[PDB]
PDB file of C-alpha atoms in Angstrom:
ATOM      1  CA  UNK O 912      -0.074   0.324   0.315  1.00 24.36           C
ATOM      2  CA  UNK O 913       0.508   3.522  -0.030  1.00 23.67           C
ATOM      3  CA  UNK O 914       0.491   3.331   3.412  1.00 22.12           C
ATOM      4  CA  UNK O 915       2.984   1.246   3.367  1.00 22.05           C
ATOM      5  CA  UNK O 916       5.071   2.817   1.456  1.00 19.97           C
ATOM      6  CA  UNK O 917       5.052   6.310   3.111  1.00 17.91           C
ATOM      7  CA  UNK O 918       5.758   4.484   7.092  1.00 21.68           C
ATOM      8  CA  UNK O 919       8.446   2.480   4.978  1.00 22.41           C
ATOM      9  CA  UNK O 920      10.321   5.983   3.477  1.00 23.38           C
ATOM     10  CA  UNK O 921      10.253   7.407   6.758  1.00 21.69           C
ATOM     11  CA  UNK O 922      11.373   4.589   8.548  1.00 20.12           C
ATOM     12  CA  UNK O 923      14.333   4.454   6.451  1.00 20.34           C
ATOM     13  CA  UNK O 924      14.940   7.978   5.114  1.00 18.64           C
ATOM     14  CA  UNK O 925      13.306   9.868   8.251  1.00 17.29           C
ATOM     15  CA  UNK O 926      11.931  12.487   6.720  1.00 19.23           C
ATOM     16  CA  UNK O 927       7.561  12.541   5.753  1.00 18.32           C
ATOM     17  CA  UNK O 928       7.070  11.340   1.466  1.00 15.55           C
ATOM     18  CA  UNK O 929       3.928  13.808   1.811  1.00 12.19           C
ATOM     19  CA  UNK O 930       5.579  16.901   3.049  1.00 13.84           C
ATOM     20  CA  UNK O 931       9.098  15.939   1.273  1.00 14.00           C
ATOM     21  CA  UNK O 932       8.157  14.318  -1.851  1.00 15.50           C
ATOM     22  CA  UNK O 933       4.484  14.256  -3.398  1.00 17.47           C
ATOM     23  CA  UNK O 934       4.912  17.795  -4.893  1.00 17.21           C
ATOM     24  CA  UNK O 935       9.065  16.914  -5.668  1.00 17.68           C
ATOM     25  CA  UNK O 936      10.182  17.524  -9.539  1.00 14.57           C
ATOM     26  CA  UNK O 937       8.397  15.397 -12.050  1.00 14.54           C
ATOM     27  CA  UNK O 938       7.235  12.199 -11.582  1.00 13.03           C
ATOM     28  CA  UNK O 939       6.777  11.881  -7.320  1.00 10.54           C
ATOM     29  CA  UNK O 940       3.198  13.436  -8.224  1.00  9.96           C
ATOM     30  CA  UNK O 941       0.921  12.580 -11.250  1.00  3.85           C
ATOM     31  CA  UNK O 942       4.584  12.006 -13.347  1.00  2.92           C
ATOM     32  CA  UNK O 943       4.380   9.407 -17.161  1.00  4.82           C
ATOM     33  CA  UNK O 944       5.775  12.936 -18.345  1.00  6.25           C
ATOM     34  CA  UNK O 945       8.935  15.237 -18.412  1.00  4.09           C
ATOM     35  CA  UNK O 946      12.853  14.964 -18.152  1.00  2.79           C
ATOM     36  CA  UNK O 947      14.090  13.442 -14.078  1.00  4.91           C
ATOM     37  CA  UNK O 948      15.097  17.048 -12.701  1.00  3.63           C
ATOM     38  CA  UNK O 949      17.404  14.923 -10.552  1.00  5.17           C
ATOM     39  CA  UNK O 950      18.504  12.286  -8.943  1.00  6.86           C
ATOM     40  CA  UNK O 951      15.477  12.371  -6.373  1.00  7.12           C
ATOM     41  CA  UNK O 952      13.354  12.587  -9.651  1.00  6.76           C
ATOM     42  CA  UNK O 953      15.593   9.918 -10.893  1.00  9.48           C
ATOM     43  CA  UNK O 954      14.665   7.509  -7.530  1.00 11.18           C
ATOM     44  CA  UNK O 955      10.805   7.992  -8.365  1.00 10.24           C
ATOM     45  CA  UNK O 956      11.007   7.056 -12.186  1.00  7.76           C
ATOM     46  CA  UNK O 957      12.576   4.171 -11.248  1.00  7.49           C
ATOM     47  CA  UNK O 958       9.716   3.639  -8.948  1.00  6.33           C
ATOM     48  CA  UNK O 959       6.660   3.919 -11.318  1.00  8.79           C
ATOM     49  CA  UNK O 960       9.054   1.599 -13.760  1.00  8.20           C
ATOM     50  CA  UNK O 961       8.428  -1.440 -11.070  1.00  8.99           C
ATOM     51  CA  UNK O 962       5.411  -0.980 -10.475  1.00  8.11           C
ATOM     52  CA  UNK O 963       4.755  -0.829 -13.524  1.00  7.23           C
ATOM     53  CA  UNK O 964       6.014  -4.166 -13.630  1.00  5.19           C
ATOM     54  CA  UNK O 965       3.237  -5.679 -11.648  1.00  4.82           C
ATOM     55  CA  UNK O 966      -0.021  -6.349 -13.755  1.00  2.22           C
ATOM     56  CA  UNK O 967      -1.834  -8.793 -11.212  1.00  4.79           C
ATOM     57  CA  UNK O 968      -2.914  -6.129  -8.212  1.00  4.05           C
ATOM     58  CA  UNK O 969      -2.823  -2.913  -7.704  1.00  5.15           C
ATOM     59  CA  UNK O 970      -0.463  -1.080  -6.624  1.00  5.09           C
ATOM     60  CA  UNK O 971      -2.112   1.330  -4.001  1.00  4.06           C
ATOM     61  CA  UNK O 972      -3.986  -0.952  -1.978  1.00  4.42           C
ATOM     62  CA  UNK O 973      -2.520  -4.632  -2.371  1.00  4.60           C
ATOM     63  CA  UNK O 974      -0.400  -4.661   1.205  1.00  4.54           C
ATOM     64  CA  UNK O 975       2.018  -6.728   2.316  1.00  2.48           C
ATOM     65  CA  UNK O 976       4.309  -7.338   5.448  1.00  2.00           C
ATOM     66  CA  UNK O 977       7.500  -6.685   5.945  1.00  2.00           C
ATOM     67  CA  UNK O 978       9.871  -7.793   8.883  1.00  2.00           C
ATOM     68  CA  UNK O 979      13.363  -5.590   9.680  1.00  2.96           C
ATOM     69  CA  UNK O 980      15.858  -8.379  10.900  1.00  2.00           C
ATOM     70  CA  UNK O 981      19.802  -6.569  12.062  1.00  2.00           C
ATOM     71  CA  UNK O 982      18.522  -4.003  10.283  1.00  2.00           C
ATOM     72  CA  UNK O 983      17.452  -5.188   6.793  1.00  2.88           C
ATOM     73  CA  UNK O 984      13.768  -4.902   5.444  1.00  3.04           C
ATOM     74  CA  UNK O 985      12.582  -8.014   4.115  1.00  2.66           C
ATOM     75  CA  UNK O 986       9.664  -8.180   1.939  1.00  3.70           C
ATOM     76  CA  UNK O 987       7.510 -10.423   2.354  1.00  2.00           C
ATOM     77  CA  UNK O 988       3.123 -12.002   2.462  1.00  2.84           C
ATOM     78  CA  UNK O 989       0.862 -14.545   0.606  1.00  3.60           C
ATOM     79  CA  UNK O 990       1.147 -12.040  -2.544  1.00  5.80           C
ATOM     80  CA  UNK O 991       3.577 -12.448  -4.618  1.00  7.13           C
ATOM     81  CA  UNK O 992       2.479  -9.383  -6.751  1.00 10.07           C
ATOM     82  CA  UNK O 993       2.583  -8.154  -3.216  1.00  8.84           C
ATOM     83  CA  UNK O 994       6.013  -8.674  -2.348  1.00  7.74           C
ATOM     84  CA  UNK O 995       6.792  -7.650  -5.540  1.00  8.29           C
ATOM     85  CA  UNK O 996       5.416  -4.342  -5.286  1.00 10.42           C
ATOM     86  CA  UNK O 997       7.076  -4.282  -1.427  1.00 10.33           C
ATOM     87  CA  UNK O 998      10.345  -4.630  -3.152  1.00 11.05           C
ATOM     88  CA  UNK O 999       9.680  -1.259  -5.503  1.00 12.46           C
ATOM     89  CA  UNK O1000       9.053   0.156  -2.085  1.00 11.01           C
ATOM     90  CA  UNK O1001      11.864  -0.496   0.159  1.00 10.38           C
ATOM     91  CA  UNK O1002      14.112   0.744  -3.058  1.00  8.65           C
ATOM     92  CA  UNK O1003      12.591   4.144  -3.729  1.00  8.37           C
ATOM     93  CA  UNK O1004      13.197   4.524  -0.014  1.00  8.93           C
ATOM     94  CA  UNK O1005      16.560   3.960   0.314  1.00 10.50           C
ATOM     95  CA  UNK O1006      17.140   5.073  -3.570  1.00 10.68           C
ATOM     96  CA  UNK O1007      15.345   9.004  -1.375  1.00  9.66           C
ATOM     97  CA  UNK O1008      17.360   8.338   2.021  1.00  9.61           C
ATOM     98  CA  UNK O1009      21.070   8.265  -0.038  1.00 10.66           C
ATOM     99  CA  UNK O1010      20.050  11.124  -2.195  1.00 11.91           C
ATOM    100  CA  UNK O1011      18.736  13.781   0.427  1.00 12.56           C
ATOM    101  CA  UNK O1012      22.219  15.863   0.375  1.00 12.35           C
ATOM    102  CA  UNK O1013      20.983  16.545  -3.472  1.00 10.65           C
ATOM    103  CA  UNK O1014      17.742  17.217  -2.664  1.00 11.72           C
ATOM    104  CA  UNK O1015      16.849  20.307  -3.974  1.00 10.75           C
ATOM    105  CA  UNK O1016      13.840  22.491  -2.940  1.00 11.35           C
ATOM    106  CA  UNK O1017      13.577  24.450  -6.687  1.00 15.81           C
ATOM    107  CA  UNK O1018      12.671  21.380  -7.658  1.00 17.33           C
ATOM    108  CA  UNK O1019       9.421  21.634  -4.784  1.00 16.59           C
ATOM    109  CA  UNK O1020       5.716  22.373  -6.123  1.00 13.37           C
ATOM    110  CA  UNK O1021       7.830  21.975  -9.780  1.00 12.66           C
ATOM    111  CA  UNK O1022       5.388  23.408 -12.206  1.00 13.86           C
ATOM    112  CA  UNK O1023       4.346  20.424 -14.594  1.00 15.87           C
ATOM    113  CA  UNK O1024       4.304  23.059 -17.188  1.00 16.87           C
ATOM    114  CA  UNK O1025       7.993  22.337 -17.461  1.00 12.54           C
ATOM    115  CA  UNK O1026       7.721  18.685 -17.831  1.00 12.45           C
ATOM    116  CA  UNK O1027       5.778  18.177 -20.368  1.00  9.95           C
ATOM    117  CA  UNK O1028       9.067  16.127 -23.275  1.00 10.67           C
ATOM    118  CA  UNK O1029       8.051  12.351 -23.732  1.00  9.40           C
ATOM    119  CA  UNK O1030       9.494   9.914 -20.920  1.00  8.47           C
ATOM    120  CA  UNK O1031      12.645   7.855 -21.539  1.00  9.68           C
ATOM    121  CA  UNK O1032      12.219   3.699 -21.960  1.00  9.21           C
ATOM    122  CA  UNK O1033      11.454   1.983 -18.547  1.00  7.87           C
TER     123      UNK O1033
ATOM    124  CA  UNK W 405      -3.382   3.468 -18.603  1.00  7.12           C
ATOM    125  CA  UNK W 406      -2.528   7.234 -17.275  1.00  7.21           C
ATOM    126  CA  UNK W 407      -2.105   7.798 -21.492  1.00  6.21           C
ATOM    127  CA  UNK W 408      -5.860   6.538 -21.882  1.00  6.51           C
ATOM    128  CA  UNK W 409      -7.268   8.517 -18.647  1.00  5.88           C
ATOM    129  CA  UNK W 410      -5.602  11.963 -19.762  1.00  5.37           C
ATOM    130  CA  UNK W 411      -6.652  11.146 -23.623  1.00  3.60           C
ATOM    131  CA  UNK W 412     -10.750  10.789 -21.962  1.00  2.00           C
ATOM    132  CA  UNK W 413      -9.612  13.838 -20.105  1.00  3.05           C
ATOM    133  CA  UNK W 414      -8.661  16.043 -23.154  1.00  2.00           C
ATOM    134  CA  UNK W 415     -11.711  15.028 -25.228  1.00  2.41           C
ATOM    135  CA  UNK W 416     -14.380  15.082 -22.442  1.00  2.00           C
ATOM    136  CA  UNK W 417     -13.872  18.302 -20.314  1.00  6.15           C
ATOM    137  CA  UNK W 418     -11.194  19.571 -23.264  1.00  9.32           C
ATOM    138  CA  UNK W 419      -8.362  20.435 -21.542  1.00  7.39           C
ATOM    139  CA  UNK W 420      -5.024  18.929 -20.697  1.00  8.65           C
ATOM    140  CA  UNK W 421      -4.783  16.609 -17.622  1.00  4.85           C
ATOM    141  CA  UNK W 422      -1.072  17.976 -16.867  1.00  4.58           C
ATOM    142  CA  UNK W 423      -2.343  21.226 -17.473  1.00  2.00           C
ATOM    143  CA  UNK W 424      -5.812  21.967 -15.783  1.00  2.78           C
ATOM    144  CA  UNK W 425      -5.293  18.538 -13.397  1.00  6.34           C
ATOM    145  CA  UNK W 426      -2.000  17.266 -12.285  1.00  2.39           C
ATOM    146  CA  UNK W 427      -1.166  19.434  -9.832  1.00  2.00           C
ATOM    147  CA  UNK W 428      -4.956  20.483  -8.199  1.00  2.00           C
ATOM    148  CA  UNK W 429      -5.852  20.659  -4.374  1.00  2.00           C
ATOM    149  CA  UNK W 430      -5.352  17.812  -2.019  1.00  4.03           C
ATOM    150  CA  UNK W 431      -6.128  14.955  -4.120  1.00  2.00           C
ATOM    151  CA  UNK W 432      -5.051  15.387  -7.737  1.00  2.00           C
ATOM    152  CA  UNK W 433      -1.062  13.974  -7.271  1.00  2.00           C
ATOM    153  CA  UNK W 434      -0.069  11.975  -4.835  1.00  2.00           C
ATOM    154  CA  UNK W 435      -3.466  11.639  -2.757  1.00  2.00           C
ATOM    155  CA  UNK W 436      -4.215  10.246   0.719  1.00  3.56           C
ATOM    156  CA  UNK W 437      -4.266  13.017   2.819  1.00  2.00           C
ATOM    157  CA  UNK W 438      -6.577  15.776   3.864  1.00  2.00           C
ATOM    158  CA  UNK W 439      -9.800  17.775   2.816  1.00  3.44           C
ATOM    159  CA  UNK W 440     -10.846  17.428  -0.915  1.00  4.44           C
ATOM    160  CA  UNK W 441     -11.212  20.955  -1.132  1.00  5.68           C
ATOM    161  CA  UNK W 442     -13.511  22.075  -3.876  1.00  2.93           C
ATOM    162  CA  UNK W 443     -15.710  20.508  -6.256  1.00  2.00           C
ATOM    163  CA  UNK W 444     -12.744  19.686  -8.676  1.00  3.82           C
ATOM    164  CA  UNK W 445     -10.730  18.137  -5.886  1.00  5.84           C
ATOM    165  CA  UNK W 446     -13.371  16.431  -4.884  1.00  2.00           C
ATOM    166  CA  UNK W 447     -13.802  14.183  -8.576  1.00  2.00           C
ATOM    167  CA  UNK W 448      -9.800  13.114  -7.434  1.00  2.00           C
ATOM    168  CA  UNK W 449     -11.357  11.376  -3.915  1.00  2.27           C
ATOM    169  CA  UNK W 450     -13.544   9.631  -5.812  1.00  2.94           C
ATOM    170  CA  UNK W 451     -11.258   8.769  -8.465  1.00  2.00           C
ATOM    171  CA  UNK W 452      -8.830   7.446  -6.035  1.00  2.00           C
ATOM    172  CA  UNK W 453     -11.945   5.676  -4.323  1.00  3.06           C
ATOM    173  CA  UNK W 454     -12.109   3.887  -7.600  1.00  3.74           C
ATOM    174  CA  UNK W 455      -9.451   2.576  -8.633  1.00  4.38           C
ATOM    175  CA  UNK W 456      -9.174   1.215  -4.809  1.00  2.19           C
ATOM    176  CA  UNK W 457     -11.843  -1.037  -5.318  1.00  2.00           C
ATOM    177  CA  UNK W 458      -9.687  -3.078  -8.384  1.00  2.00           C
ATOM    178  CA  UNK W 459      -8.073  -5.622  -6.670  1.00  2.00           C
ATOM    179  CA  UNK W 460      -6.855  -7.673  -9.872  1.00  2.00           C
ATOM    180  CA  UNK W 461      -4.764  -4.978 -12.053  1.00  2.00           C
ATOM    181  CA  UNK W 462      -2.724  -2.075 -12.005  1.00  2.00           C
ATOM    182  CA  UNK W 463      -5.122   1.050 -12.817  1.00  2.00           C
ATOM    183  CA  UNK W 464      -1.964   2.814 -14.580  1.00  2.00           C
ATOM    184  CA  UNK W 465      -0.884   0.482 -16.787  1.00  2.00           C
ATOM    185  CA  UNK W 466      -3.870  -1.204 -17.806  1.00  2.00           C
ATOM    186  CA  UNK W 467      -4.810  -0.917 -20.877  1.00  2.00           C
ATOM    187  CA  UNK W 468      -8.503  -0.662 -22.078  1.00  2.00           C
ATOM    188  CA  UNK W 469     -10.231   0.139 -24.910  1.00  2.00           C
ATOM    189  CA  UNK W 470     -13.190   3.205 -25.592  1.00  2.00           C
ATOM    190  CA  UNK W 471     -15.862   4.901 -27.938  1.00  2.00           C
ATOM    191  CA  UNK W 472     -17.594   7.377 -29.323  1.00  2.00           C
ATOM    192  CA  UNK W 473     -21.095   7.096 -29.372  1.00  2.00           C
ATOM    193  CA  UNK W 474     -22.294  10.280 -29.920  1.00  2.00           C
ATOM    194  CA  UNK W 475     -21.624  12.996 -27.443  1.00  2.00           C
ATOM    195  CA  UNK W 476     -20.365  10.026 -25.125  1.00  2.00           C
ATOM    196  CA  UNK W 477     -17.948   7.853 -24.644  1.00  2.00           C
ATOM    197  CA  UNK W 478     -17.992   4.202 -24.317  1.00  2.00           C
ATOM    198  CA  UNK W 479     -15.838   2.038 -22.401  1.00  2.00           C
ATOM    199  CA  UNK W 480     -14.414  -1.439 -22.939  1.00  2.00           C
ATOM    200  CA  UNK W 481     -11.862  -3.689 -22.621  1.00  2.00           C
ATOM    201  CA  UNK W 482      -9.412  -7.244 -22.990  1.00  2.00           C
ATOM    202  CA  UNK W 483     -11.345  -7.868 -19.387  1.00  2.00           C
ATOM    203  CA  UNK W 484     -13.156  -7.025 -16.668  1.00  2.00           C
ATOM    204  CA  UNK W 485     -10.531  -5.164 -14.648  1.00  2.00           C
ATOM    205  CA  UNK W 486     -10.142  -3.116 -17.822  1.00  2.00           C
ATOM    206  CA  UNK W 487     -13.294  -2.304 -18.438  1.00  2.00           C
ATOM    207  CA  UNK W 488     -13.694  -1.401 -14.746  1.00  2.00           C
ATOM    208  CA  UNK W 489     -11.157   1.889 -14.497  1.00  2.00           C
ATOM    209  CA  UNK W 490     -12.166   2.782 -17.687  1.00  2.00           C
ATOM    210  CA  UNK W 491     -15.191   3.934 -16.059  1.00  2.00           C
ATOM    211  CA  UNK W 492     -13.575   5.520 -12.998  1.00  2.00           C
ATOM    212  CA  UNK W 493     -11.885   7.817 -15.385  1.00  2.00           C
ATOM    213  CA  UNK W 494     -14.515   8.785 -17.646  1.00  2.00           C
ATOM    214  CA  UNK W 495     -16.350   9.314 -14.450  1.00  2.00           C
ATOM    215  CA  UNK W 496     -13.455  11.531 -13.344  1.00  2.00           C
ATOM    216  CA  UNK W 497     -13.083  13.464 -16.937  1.00  2.00           C
ATOM    217  CA  UNK W 498     -16.912  14.292 -16.531  1.00  2.00           C
ATOM    218  CA  UNK W 499     -16.997  15.360 -13.015  1.00  2.00           C
ATOM    219  CA  UNK W 500     -14.173  17.049 -14.412  1.00  2.00           C
ATOM    220  CA  UNK W 501     -15.773  18.875 -17.463  1.00  2.00           C
ATOM    221  CA  UNK W 502     -18.842  19.627 -15.154  1.00  2.00           C
ATOM    222  CA  UNK W 503     -17.416  22.130 -11.911  1.00  2.00           C
ATOM    223  CA  UNK W 504     -15.398  23.895 -14.739  1.00  2.00           C
ATOM    224  CA  UNK W 505     -16.995  26.990 -13.302  1.00  2.02           C
ATOM    225  CA  UNK W 506     -15.606  26.679 -10.214  1.00  2.00           C
ATOM    226  CA  UNK W 507     -12.264  26.098 -10.858  1.00  2.00           C
ATOM    227  CA  UNK W 508      -9.567  27.950  -8.941  1.00  2.00           C
ATOM    228  CA  UNK W 509      -6.790  28.655  -9.866  1.00  2.00           C
ATOM    229  CA  UNK W 510      -5.727  29.253  -5.732  1.00  2.00           C
ATOM    230  CA  UNK W 511      -5.459  25.289  -5.985  1.00  2.00           C
ATOM    231  CA  UNK W 512      -3.223  24.905  -8.532  1.00  2.00           C
ATOM    232  CA  UNK W 513       0.049  23.454  -6.784  1.00  2.00           C
ATOM    233  CA  UNK W 514      -1.729  23.879  -3.275  1.00  2.00           C
ATOM    234  CA  UNK W 515       1.082  23.303  -0.599  1.00  2.00           C
ATOM    235  CA  UNK W 516       0.975  19.187   1.137  1.00  2.00           C
ATOM    236  CA  UNK W 517       1.077  20.597   4.627  1.00  2.00           C
ATOM    237  CA  UNK W 518      -2.411  22.328   4.021  1.00  2.00           C
ATOM    238  CA  UNK W 519      -3.140  18.978   3.499  1.00  2.00           C
ATOM    239  CA  UNK W 520      -2.055  17.307   7.145  1.00  2.00           C
ATOM    240  CA  UNK W 521      -5.763  16.358   7.437  1.00  2.00           C
ATOM    241  CA  UNK W 522      -7.180  12.309   7.877  1.00  2.00           C
ATOM    242  CA  UNK W 523      -8.958  11.439   5.055  1.00  2.00           C
ATOM    243  CA  UNK W 524     -12.579  10.612   4.859  1.00  2.00           C
ATOM    244  CA  UNK W 525     -13.628   6.954   3.900  1.00  2.00           C
ATOM    245  CA  UNK W 526     -14.140   6.694   0.508  1.00  2.00           C
TER     246      UNK W 526
END
């Protein structure tokens, strides 16, 4: 789930998804267009592309189970389509944590006006 | 799919979903937080609650078919979840279409931080 996605971003990145990335660059919100404005904007694109390989479940309502053990998150559950969305979730929060150092607010509330190119293949 | 949602909106509302609705209000982008601010934000509230009832396919990448039948857009697909999703998107473009008179640019690139409010049940 999205709820599950937000909680891994706080657990791992130590910042709110809502307040730090829901409207960051060309891909974190709506998406579908534009050129990745930076690293953090690229985390986002790589995130949609993975959700993209799931064709059997709703990436936003599907709920999964994860365990954390020796500071490592482990994806799981009775839904292989969920497990798969958790793994994608996991990687976007790590992706996020490590690109903070280059995070730029100039890309916060980025006008869609500037994100009209055609997206790059996944 | 997203690309088909976007075509619906242009075709039915007569505008760029990217440029009039991708960043509007508390729900047109990431969603899951706050209170619908107006007529238009709410179309995206329900749009979102619509996709949450589809558990078997990916709303963003499932591909459906649509037809023009005399003022009307008729939904189809290869399967039931694909058809299901067309209808969510068709209903959203129709709501967009019809609340055009109340559209307010003040909810355009709306800070998330004004959407901390907890959501109401779908």
